[PDB]
């Protein structure tokens, strides 16, 4: 697994294991300059001694470590070394192996700091923001279905615009009827109250529920109207899907008791809590 | 003359002075060759060797490493000490502290390694350079190359007492009342101050009460003005 990175911290740990004892003897390198207030200075010595206990903690750190070992030792890395002398002038690639990573890592910061944009204007510098091809919808559908344990379906019986339905662990399916590219004008229900497979005769609208999911529907509409980025509609629908995923539990109830109202949910901050409080 | 020994043909210090007429190496031989018994004074002598006498030991060590430094940008470098007479006096000091350590195990060894008696080899190299420089000798013999070897025993960071001066050459020296502008070895010298530490300007840098029980010899011997000791000053410790 990825627990190997934990060993990195362990490295720093044993580093202190050295420094600690140095900080001990350095503290013994000189005596009382001028206490004049108390004799805790000597205790200060023992204070450094206390940090030596940290070393024992290092031994404890190995209890959580050693999850399991992976097969095929050496992880296909030194296979290039098995080549003849002709292959040895190849380490460069391995360097790039880190470099590329750094690249990503650099972007990992850069893109992050790209969040604070400076686009004083976005028009009068040019188009067709509505996606022409009726194939990018299927692309977005497949990208969403790439997510596990969350099934998505779509029929689009109305026309050019997009129509889709999504289901989760509960029967709280969500019907989203939006334009070509970005999600807008959706609704949610629960327990066959919509039944948008063959409701009456087709995927009906019915604009209703028993006064429980209505707040969730309004919040999802707000999230759709708020996450409408100027570009990258795929990012928009992915953010929408991630937001929708946050209701798969409906179990916790922080910053209040589980008796304030019918339910509780408003996670635009990537964390749900008691509703009617933000 | 600090020996309460038993009398003999001549004085103890006087008879010790003639040690010059002795072989080069193996001080352990010459010590019993002159006299061994009448040199102990009392049990309460275990305060000088491990505390203050160690200096002289380190002293001779500081000579060795400083021996091959003629090419340095200083003709005598740190020091030269090629007098011989004073060197003979120091060699007598070495043999008497050797018989002292023979009388008590709390002497000043090399403190580092090769104890199974570095002092013996140190002393023999010193006597070698002595006899090589006693009566108008050479300086840098082939022996110089071999004694120049750095044994893993030499310590560093010695005081080498000194003081500033007044280099007011010709024109002007303006100072304030305070905040000067730039331009006894019985231990008693830690990193930070630990007592009143009444010091002096010549070389002393010592403590005020000497913090001892029966070492009053040195303390009483230096309560008054020390070597040009008009500069017996005092200053408190710093506070944060």
UniProtKB/Swiss-Prot annotation, chain A:
Tell me the first and last residues of the signal peptide.
Answer: none
**A biological process from GO:** regulation of transcription by RNA polymerase II
Q: Which residues carry this modification: N6-methyllysine?
A: 120
Q: Which residues carry this modification: Phosphoserine?
A: 118
Tell me where in or outside the cell this protein is found. Nucleus
Q: Which InterPro entries match?
A: Mediator_Med27
Report the protein's function. Component of the Mediator complex, a coactivator involved in the regulated transcription of nearly all RNA polymerase II-dependent genes. Mediator functions as a bridge to convey information from gene-specific regulatory proteins to the basal RNA polymerase II transcription machinery. Mediator is recruited to promoters by direct interactions with regulatory proteins and serves as a scaffold for the assembly of a functional preinitiation complex with RNA polymerase II and the general transcription factors.
Name of the protein this chain belongs to: Mediator of RNA polymerase II transcription subunit 27
Organism of origin: Mus musculus
Q: What is the lineage of its organism?
A: Eukaryota, Metazoa, Chordata, Craniata, Vertebrata
From Swiss-Prot, chain B:
WD repeat placement: 69-110, 189-228
Q: Where does the protein end up?
A: Nucleus
Q: Assembly state and interactors?
A: Component of the Mediator complex, which is composed of MED1, MED4, MED6, MED7, MED8, MED9, MED10, MED11, MED12, MED13, MED13L, MED14, MED15, MED16, MED17, MED18, MED19, MED20, MED21, MED22, MED23, MED24, MED25, MED26, MED27, MED29, MED30, MED31, CCNC, CDK8 and CDC2L6/CDK11. The MED12, MED13, CCNC and CDK8 subunits form a distinct module termed the CDK8 module. Mediator containing the CDK8 module is less active than Mediator lacking this module in supporting transcriptional activation.
Q: State the function annotated in the UniProt record.
A: Component of the Mediator complex, a coactivator involved in the regulated transcription of nearly all RNA polymerase II-dependent genes. Mediator functions as a bridge to convey information from gene-specific regulatory proteins to the basal RNA polymerase II transcription machinery. Mediator is recruited to promoters by direct interactions with regulatory proteins and serves as a scaffold for the assembly of a functional preinitiation complex with RNA polymerase II and the general transcription factors.
Q: Per the similarity annotation, which family is this?
A: Belongs to the Mediator complex subunit 16 family.
Q: What is this protein called?
A: Mediator of RNA polymerase II transcription subunit 16
Parent-protein residues present = 553 to 828 of 828
């Amino acid at each position: 697994g990825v627990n190997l990175e934990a060993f990195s911290q362990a490295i720093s740990a044993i580093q202190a294991l050295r420094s600690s004892v140095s900080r001990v003897f350095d503290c013994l390198k000189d005596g009382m300059r001028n206490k004049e207030t108390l004799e805790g200075r000597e205790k200060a010595f023992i204070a450094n001694f206390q940090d030596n206990l940290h070393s024992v903690n290092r031994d404890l750190n190995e209890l959580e470590r050693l999850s399991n070992l992976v097969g095929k030792p050496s992880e296909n890395h030194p296979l290039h070394n098995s080549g003849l002398l002709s292959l040895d002038p190849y380490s460069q690639l391995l360097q790039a192996y880190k470099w590329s990573n750094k690249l990503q890592y650099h972007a990992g910061l850069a893109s992050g700091l790209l969040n604070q944009q400076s686009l004083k204007r976005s028009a009068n510098q040019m188009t067709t923001l509505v996606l022409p091809p009726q194939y990018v919808d299927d692309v977005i559908s497949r990208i969403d279905r790439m997510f596990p344990e969350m099934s998505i379906h779509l029929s689009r019986p109305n026309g050019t615009s997009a129509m889709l339905l999504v289901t989760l662990g509960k029967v709280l399916k969500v019907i989203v009827v939006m334009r070509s590219l970005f999600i807008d004008r959706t609704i949610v229900k629960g327990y066959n109250e919509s039944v948008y497979t063959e409701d009456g005769k087709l995927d009906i609208w019915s604009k209703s529920s028993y006064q429980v999911f209505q707040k969730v529907t309004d919040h999802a509409t707000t999230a759709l109207l708020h996450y409408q980025l100027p570009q990258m509609p795929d990012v928009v629908v992915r953010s929408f899907m991630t937001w929708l995923r946050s209701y798969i539990k409906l179990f916790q109830a922080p910053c209040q008791r589980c008796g304030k109202f019918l339910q509780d949910g408003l996670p635009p901050t990537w964390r749900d809590f008691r509703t009617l409080e933000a | 003359p600090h020996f309460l020994n038993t009398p003999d043909k001549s004085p103890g210090d006087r008879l010790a002075e003639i040690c010059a007429k002795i072989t080069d190496v193996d001080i352990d031989k010459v010590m019993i060759n002159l006299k061994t018994e009448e040199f102990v004074l009392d049990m309460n002598t275990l305060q000088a060797l491990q505390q203050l006498l160690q200096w002289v030991g380190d002293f001779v060590l500081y000579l060795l490493v400083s021996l091959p430094n003629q090419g340095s940008p200083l003709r005598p470098g740190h020091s030269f000490l090629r007098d011989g007479t004073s060197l003979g006096m120091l060699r007598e000091l070495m043999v008497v502290i050797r018989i002292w350590g023979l009388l008590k195990p709390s002497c000043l060894p090399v403190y580092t390694a090769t104890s199974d008696d570095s002092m013996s080899l140190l002393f023999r190299l010193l006597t070698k350079l002595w006899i090589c420089c006693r009566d108008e000798g050479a300086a840098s013999p082939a022996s110089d190359g071999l004694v120049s070897r750095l044994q893993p025993k030499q310590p560093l960071r010695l005081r080498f007492g000194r003081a500033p001066t007044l280099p007011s050459s010709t024109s002007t020296l303006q100072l304030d009342g305070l905040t000067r502008a730039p331009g006894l070895h019985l231990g008693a010298y830690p990193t930070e101050e630990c007592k009143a530490c009444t010091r002096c300007g010549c070389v002393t840098m010592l403590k005020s009460p000497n913090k001892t029980t029966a070492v009053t010899q040195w303390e009483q011997r230096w309560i008054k003005n020390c070597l040009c000791g008009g500069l017996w000053r005092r200053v408190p410790l710093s506070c944060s």
